Design a protein around this ligand. Structure first.
Ligand SMILES: Nc1nc2c(ncn2[C@@H]2O[C@H](COP(=O)(O)OP(=O)(O)NP(=O)(O)O)[C@@H](O)[C@H]2O)c(=O)[nH]1
Ligand SMILES: Nc1nc2c(ncn2[C@@H]2O[C@H](COP(=O)(O)OP(=O)(O)O)[C@@H](O)[C@H]2O)c(=O)[nH]1
Lengths: 290, 304
């Protein structure tokens, strides 16, 4: 009977191990390791290791893989004790953060030096977690690969198919001023809406198919991006984006809902733009202030 | 014709400006600023600023907002010069790091004092980025709000809900599940008795001293479930490369109580033909009684 252990490292690895326990994976011993004692405390695993107990003190490593690496080196003897006797060790982690990225290669090396067949199984971060976390992931992936027998890499980007939001926010306002289309706005109109206003709420929704203008406009009003409710906003800007087939009739049908949803005396302005990638699809974007 | 400038600060802002240029946003001038001179040199932007060229020496701020703030102050003249004449300035940054958090409010202050309508548009961190980063982010946000006309705040938590289509609490449920399947694909074959198990020594032959192991999963149902499941596994989006030409592979065939030997046999033959050559294939089976007229084929391929 092979002795099989899974050690889940960092937040992602800790949650993966919880999933394995709740799915009833059999024949396997589960261990979780983290520098963050809070995640460890809600673990379903019976074998818990707080990495770097003396230096990080269970408070977490933060963003920097060097701290997760040093935490695992400090805990080397506890890790060897937990893994001792394994014929096979899976090292589970999400690349991108301070703990999984830096600790997983150390733990792989210790497991393999004990004689276990050592399999790394990791995720890599979304593109939109940004270049710094993706760059850490790349370096931690290479360091782990050095120390595991085999490495399985699961891309969170690709796992979706089984994109930049700061761009969408800017273009929502600028196309209405700088790109002439069916309807456009003056810069002085944007200024009355946005000058000396504080918080501005951003919502986006998209409608596929004919009644799109009602669908998109309705998703926008409740977009999770909305920091608060748009109800009662003194002023608001609406951007109705579409394809070559976009019409002025549909535009006011989208805007009508938003004017309804805000109600009151809302100084509401709007405008249009077209997109060479959308056929019948039509996305509504709202910015409201007050 | 209004003068509109976007200044992207730090990693997230630089990234955002690159994507605006590539998407061909029109009617806008773009500027990038970073303490990191390396990230800047790659930028496609025509207007570049290395913040704090003396105090930071071209090296990033290292998660410390104090360094972003001081590098921006030191570069105030270059910032004024790039923004001069704007009717509207968008200040774009990601809160929580060293550069964006500290530099964005200084840049907004400068832009607004020059006369621009000044709009901050920022992300705030994913909750999994931890406590110190989410706390820096909130300070940075409150400082930025003092120096902009308006502030659009995009939570990266909410952005992940919007992109994945599920509540935050479930945002990584599929990833957790794939990691569980990656383990279970192999461990069931070794440790859970079924009609077809594999010996640990044979797993070792496939996985020891290998490097990258390709992983694919497919599910199928109905009369042609094996053809459907196996072909989905071999072009699975999870695979980091083609399995064509692998030297060894493990195949897990999991089905319900109605799975036939013929189904399991067809799936193994499809994977062998897809890989090709003289691939050493080993395979085993597993029962999951919650499957109803479905089967799941998983492949782990090594050796390139
Ligand atoms: N949606 C989104 N968020 C990003 C992106 N890039 C970075 N971020 C977010 O912005 C936060 C700050 O990242 P970043 O801009 O690289 O910080 P910095 O200040 O430039 N780098 P440093 O800390 O090394 O000085 C990140 O913690 C993350 O939450 C991105 O492309 N998209
Ligand atoms: N499978 C899974 N992945 C996660 C989860 N949370 C975050 N991630 C991904 O894993 C990467 C690292 O997150 P985490 O493990 O919490 O970082 P760390 O503990 O600080 O090292 C992130 O960059 C995300 O891409 C989760 O709960 N489950």
């Amino acid at each position: 009977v092979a002795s099989i252990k899974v050690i889940g490292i960092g937040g992602a690895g800790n949650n993966a191990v919880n999933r394995m326990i709740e799915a009833g994976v059999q024949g396997v011993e589960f261990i979780v390791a983290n520098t963050d004692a809070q995640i460890i405390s809600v673990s379903k695993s019976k074998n818990k290791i707080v990495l770097g107990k003396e230096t990080s003190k269970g408070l977490g490593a933060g963003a920097n893989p060097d701290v997760g690496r040093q935490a695992a080196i400090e805990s080397a003897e506890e890790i060897k004790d937990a893994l001792k006797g394994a014929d096979m060790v899976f090292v589970a982690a999400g690349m991108g953060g301070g703990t999984g990225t830096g600790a997983a290669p150390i733990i792989a090396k210790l497991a393999r030096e004990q004689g276990a067949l050592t399999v790394g199984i990791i995720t890599t971060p979304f593109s939109f977690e940004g270049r710094a976390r993706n760059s850490y992931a790349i370096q931690g992936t290479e360091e782990l690969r050095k120390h595991v027998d085999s490495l399985i890499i699961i891309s969170n980007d690709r796992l979706l198919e089984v994109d930049n939001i700061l761009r969408q926010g800017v273009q929502t306002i600028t196309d209405l001023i700088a790109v002439p289309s069916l309807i456009n706005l003056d810069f002085a109109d944007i200024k009355t809406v946005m000058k000396n206003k504080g918080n501005a709420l951003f919502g986006i929704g998209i409608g596929s198919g004919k009644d799109k203008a009602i669908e998109a406009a309705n998703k926008a009003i409740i977009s999770p991006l909305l920091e608060a409710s748009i109800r009662g906003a003194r002023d608001a800007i609406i951007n109705v984006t579409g394809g070559n087939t976009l019409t002025l009739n549909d535009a006011n049908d989208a805007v009508d809902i938003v004017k309804q949803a805000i109600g009151g005396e809302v100084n509401i302005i709007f405008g249009t733009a077209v997109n060479e990638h959308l056929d019948d699809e039509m996305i509504v974007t709202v910015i409201a202030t007050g």
